[PDB]
Structures are given as C-alpha cells and as structure tokens.
Amino acid sequence: EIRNIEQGVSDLNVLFQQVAQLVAEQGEVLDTIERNVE
Amino acid sequence: SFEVIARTAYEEGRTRLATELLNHEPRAGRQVPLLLSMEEDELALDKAIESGDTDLIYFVIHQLRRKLPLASFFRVVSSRPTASAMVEALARNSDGDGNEDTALLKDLYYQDDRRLDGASVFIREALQQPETRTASDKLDLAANLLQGNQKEHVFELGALKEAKMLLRMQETFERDLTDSFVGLSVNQTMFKLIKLGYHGRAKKIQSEFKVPERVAWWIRLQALVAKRDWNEIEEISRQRKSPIGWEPFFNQVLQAGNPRLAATFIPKCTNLEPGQTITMYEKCGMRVKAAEEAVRLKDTEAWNRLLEAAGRNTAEGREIERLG
C-alpha cells in the first residue's frame, strides 16, 4: 500500500543531500598551490 | 706591415678549412664545441647566436671571457649585439639579481665610447648612496663622462646639474626646518613647502628650476587645499589672468572645502559652456543666487526648474519668484 511512497521520501531525500554537497563543494577558498604555502 | 699580414692570411686559412666542416656533420649543438676547440672563437659565437639557443651562446661567451685578453673579449663581443646584450645583462645578474659586476660595464661602455650607458651606471650608484655628499660625487662622475661630447648631451648634463642643486637645497631645508625633504622631486618639494606654510622658500624653488607657471599654479592650488589656507587662496582670486584658468580654482576648492569660497570664481571663468554658470551656483548649495543667475541669462526654463525645486513658499521661494 504505502510501500511505494517510502522510496520516494528516500529518493527525494538523498537528492537534496547531493545538491547540499555540491553547493558546499563550491565552498569558500578554491584549492591552489599558493594557498598551501601560507 | 708584414708581421701582421701572416696572421691575416693564416687565420683566413684556418677559417678556410673550418668552414669545411659546417657542411659535413652539422648542426648547432655539435658544431660550436668543435669550432671552439679549433680556436675559431668568432665563428663558434656567431654559429651559437644563429642557433637562437641562449644557453649555447653563454657557453661560447663564458669560454671567450677567460680565454681572451679582456680588451679583446670586449672587441669580439661588441661586434655582435646579441652577445654584447647578454654580457651586459649578466653583469647585472651574477647573484642573482641585486649584485652587480659594475667594473665590467664601466670598462665595456668605455671601450665602445657608449657615454649615455656609462653615465647611467654612475647615476645608478648615486641612488645607492646613504649620504647626499657621496651621492653628488657619483653624479659628478656621470657628468664628467658626458662633458665630452657636450652637444646632444646638453639636457642630461643640465638634468644632472639640476639634480645636484635640488639635493643641495633639500639638504639645507632639513638643517633649518627639521623635516624630510631629501629625495623628493622639485614638484613634490614646492608642494610640501607650501602645505607647511613656507610660501617664501617654495618660490625660490620655482625660480631656480624654471618650473613652468601653469605647473607652479597647479601645485600651489593643491598644496593650499591641503593646508586649508583659504585666506591666500582668497588673495590669489584678486587678479585678472590665470594661466590655468579659474575653473580649476572652482572645482578644486569646491571638493572638500567651502562652497562659499568656490562660487566666487564665477564669473571669472572665461572658458565656460553656455548655461553652466547656473549649475555651478546650484552645486554650491546657493539655490537663491542660482535662480538670480538663471534670469540674467534669460533662461526662464532654468528659473522654472529651480522654483519647482523649492516650491513657491518653501525657502521663501517668493524670492525666487520675485526675481522674475
């Protein structure tokens, strides 16, 4: 019965986990060589 | 006459059979170490320069340097610009950077009678000095190089004499007034002297270095806004002509200062565009006197816009109205 909605609230749940990661993957100071010398 | 002819023929023979190898078993990489073994210095270098390989060129140059008499080294290397260029540059880099083989440049530039390049070396020395007394001694040497020719080097020599003079007067200013002066340019000196109120000395600077009037005015105007001396700014306005106009006096005083003192330069402003006198009174915050000017030029549209700004009642407004 409701054993088809349970996947949807897990699908659309992890969907937002990735988008939250990517928007964090563009987080602050980008990796460079000079940044690692200071 | 003969003793040298044997050389002119022999070496012209060593070259004959040497060129009989740039054909078989070339190129560049292997052929300049070969030529350099056979005491064909001048050919090795030229071959290296043609190759474009900077590192190769160095190798023949470095070899020539310790092999040949230095006088002859300079001779050989100065025939070829690209070689002289690199010898010249390296004499500025043997550390690297900073440290200088000045002795090499001095000797090199003298042999080629390169006086500008030689004099320039001494100017570089004058900058490194801690005392202006020893700094002036370096400039003297620079000047002494240029005193021979004389023609063409007229400006440089004048410039040098100008610089020696400027340092001497600057050294004086420190003794008397207890402040930094040595090192500053002529223009920077007139500025600091005026900002500090020493109006008299500044004029002695202007006179000695033949400072262009239009420049002197621009320096004075800027240096007085610094001192905020609106009184002697006021005193300058009391004459007819200005070599820089009065619009500079307008805009420069208006910026960070009195809208009051600024507006008094209209209508001394000869070079102005029509109906700009109005907007100037506006920027000075004098809406009252602005409307009055709008009328004199018979531009009632400006009279309309200025009254609409106020509003027939506020800021009197009638006073704006009564002027029409």
Add this chain to the structure above:
Amino acid sequence: AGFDAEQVRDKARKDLLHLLEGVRGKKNLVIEKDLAGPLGVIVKASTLRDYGVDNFFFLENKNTGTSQRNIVFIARGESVRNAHAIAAQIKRIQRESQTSHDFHIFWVPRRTLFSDKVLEEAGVLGDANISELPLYFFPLERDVLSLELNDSFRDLYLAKDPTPVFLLSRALMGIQKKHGLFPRIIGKGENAKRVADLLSRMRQELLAGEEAGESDRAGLSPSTTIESVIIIDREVDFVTPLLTQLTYEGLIDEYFGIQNNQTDVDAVRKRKIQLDGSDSLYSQLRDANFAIVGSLLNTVARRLKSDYESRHNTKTTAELKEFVKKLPGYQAEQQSLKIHSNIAEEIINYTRTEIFNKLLEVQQNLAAGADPSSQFDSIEELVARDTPLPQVLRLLCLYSCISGGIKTKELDHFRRLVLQGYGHQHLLTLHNLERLQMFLSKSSPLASMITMSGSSGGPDQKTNYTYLRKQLRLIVDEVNEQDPNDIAYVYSGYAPLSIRLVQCVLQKQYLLSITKGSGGGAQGWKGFEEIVKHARGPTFDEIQKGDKKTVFVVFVGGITFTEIAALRFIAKQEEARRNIVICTTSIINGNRMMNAAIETATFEK
C-alpha cells in the same frame, strides 16, 4: 584528430607527476613563485598531495622545512637567478640539517649548461637529482596558449635576450611534431622572423638526425589539421597595449591586474578571484565592451530570478527532481553575478574620475589623429596634478609611437615635466624608454615612419600609423557596442593595428569592404603587400613542403585582452571554416610595459 588545447594540459600534468613518482616516498616541495601560478593551470594541489607532498614552499621564501627527507625543486632553468637560489638553499639545509636529504631538481623546461656551472661551483651538483620538465604552453583557455613568461617583455625589448623567442620556437615545434608541419608560416616583425627561422633550423636538425641514424622513425609532412600559423611581433604595434583597454576583462587587468586567470579583490587583507571561461557568466562578460556590462549584468539577473520561480508547475517527482537538478547551477550563477556586480561597480568608479577621463580624452585625440601639440596642455596638467607615473608615460610613449617621434622643442619640455614631476632618478626611466624606442625625438633616425614617398633609407623604420589609420581603417566611429560589427568595439572606435594585420591574411574581402567598397586561396599577404609594408619589421610567408582546420595566431612579446577578445570576435565569424587558437609569450598590458622601464631607486634616506 585535430589540435586540442586539452592534450597540452594533460601532457603537462602527466610529465610533472611521472617525475614525482621517480622520487619514491613522500617529499617536501619547493617552487619558484612566478611558476606556481602557471602550474595551477595544469594540476591541482590535491593531486600533488596524493603523490606525496607534505608542505609547500616558495623558493624565494628561504624557509624550506626539514620535515620530510626528499626535497624537490621546480624552477625555470633558463633563469640565472634560479640556479644561484637553489644552490644557496642546498647549503642552508646541508649545514643546518639533521638528516642528509635527497635533493631533486626539475628544470623547466630543460637542464641548461649554465645551471650546472652554478651548481658545480657550489659543490652541491653531486647531491642533485636533476630532471627535465618540458612545460611550454600553459593552456589558459581552449583558444589561448601562453608561455607565462612575465618578464619576457623586459627581457626581449630592453635586454635583447633571445630566450623567449627560443622557447616559443620550441613550443611551436612541439605542435608540429604532434600534428605535422605548418603548411604556411606567415608573419610580420623582426622576432616573428626569428621564430620562423628557428622553426626552419630545428626542422633541418630533425632531418639531419633521422637521416644520420638518430632514428626517431619519422619524419614530418605538412599537416592536415592545420591551415597555417600567423606570427605578429609586438614591437610592430606598441600603441594597442599602451591604450587603456575598454573591454570588461581589459579594464579588470588595467585596474585589478590579472595573473594566471586570477586576481585580488577586497569585498566579494583581501581575497583571490578565479577568472576563466568555466564560469558561464564571465564567458559572455569578458570579451564585451564595458559600457554594455550593465545591460548584460541586469539581463542575466533578469533571467535568473524568473528561472528560479519557473517550473514549480508539474509537481510530479521529475519536474521538481529536474528543478533541484538545476539547483546548484543556479546558486553558482547567483554568487558569480554578485561578484561581477561588485567588480563592475568598482570599475565604474575608476572610470568616472577626472584624471581617468582626462587621460582617455588625450588617448582618444592621439588615436584619432589629432595634432599631438593640442594635447600638450592636458599632459602638463596631468603631471602637475601628480597622476601616477605609469599612466603619464603611456601618454608620452603613445604620443611618440603614433606620430613618429616628438618635436624636439616639445620633447625637452616633457622630459623637464617627468624629471621635476617625479624625480631625477627617471633620467634612467626615460633612457630606458629610449632604448625601447617608444619615446624618441623626431630628430632621431630611429623615430621615422615607413613612407613610400620619402625616398628610401632607414633599416628599422617605425610603424606609420598616419598612413595606416586610413588605409587599414583604424578608426570606426559607426560601431555599435550592443551588437558589434567590427573589432574596433574593443577600444570604442579604434581597431588594434595588430589584429587588422591578421585580418589582412584571414579576412581580406571584409577589409576591402570597410575601405574602398565592394576557400583555398588566395592565402598569404596577397593583395595587402603595400599596406603591410608600412608596418615595422619584415613581412614574410614561408611555405613548408579538406574540412575546417585550425589557425594559430602567435604573438611574440605579449598580447592584450583586447587583442584576445578581438581575435575571439573573428574566430566566431570564422567558426565554420576555421578554428583560431591564440599563442603568446605572455599576456601584456600598458602598466607591465612601463614597469619594464621605470627606475624605482629614489635618492632618499
């Protein structure tokens, strides 16, 4: 099967990493500062850690840590300074050490004889694992290759150092070795000819090698994926880099200064911004005239907000799943827009001041062909008002370069202005501008312009901008900048002489169209021989013996963002039949040029 800028990046990274493998175990890294930047274009510091790097150190910092045992050096090998610098550090760490340390040196791009001699005359040569890192072109974009030799302009035109020409030749030769001989080597200018001559000398040595059993299998034939290479010498057109650039990226370089696709700003000490073609917004903004940036900036803000609202319609998994899909791409675009709104804002303030407009006013008159004496009062004002020395000197050099010298009476005054204005040290500064032949008296043989009426004479006659202003339509006042119809948009009415020369090769029909009126061939300088003759240096077209091919436009001695944008403007017009790829020794501008000449010593305490 054609040329791809990505294969350059890949080779560069792979060549670097294969040398890091060679030193087994973990290692501490030491890099030449003005080499770290360019390296960041081919490799991540992330990737470097994976290959065993603990701490990073600039060579010019003199603080290499004794942490790890292996010490790896990466510096350009042609540099006299770098050789001494490393040797000095190998003694600072051999007489302050606690362990023996393994010392590795990766010379870019090669181990030089000089390098060894400096290392030898320090004893530390024996304790040195010396390898070669054949880095040449750093691919800054898919269509931009640069050697990233920052001091190449000073080196070449002031010091008369053939190193940049040598490297660039080798770099270009690398392209030939992979993709075949350039069918045509077309060029203009002295150093363009030197590059071409080295390309022919190196070719013969490859044929002398393969013939004499050095093998290498083969054996080079004309390319099938390359139309030609066009080489322009920077000393042919000093004017274009002297002018204040008016494109968005140009003005950014003019005010913020762009290095290695990056820059510094204060309000997003200060922070570092990345500036390259990845960011979809910057792509459209960079090559555009700064005027229409507002029009463009808003339009993108106008489209983003009504692209976030949209598509909550079909509230069925997908059309939201698809919305959340395009969600990180919105946020990025949103933060990009906020940055380039701030940046655009700062630049708008720079361009509104008096001094800027006074400068640009002078620039416009000189360019257009007004009598430079009319601009004398303006220049004098600018010196008197203590406007920055680089900008004043650029007006002076622009004056000299575009009018074939300065009148001898006006010249003596300008010199007085500079000396008294900024300090007598600049007796040297003016001497250097004289050596660069960018600031000469009209009574100097070197200052004369190429004329086909003024008899013969003159070995290094200068570019005649007076003749070329009309004959190559250097002025276009028509140009609309919302939808630019011609490269002259980059300077709001003035097309760079350099890129007009390229158009004499590539877009011949169009050029005649904007002059008098009304593939396969005809290639070369054909039909424009007399016009190009009035530009400095040798004109040449060496020949070495289907569908759209690539064309390399090479700048020896620096290129400007304006010239890059202009070239991109043409690349689009030619997108069908040609792929235009830009190469250069460095990326240059007016301030970098002046810095080559300006003496910084000071007569002070």
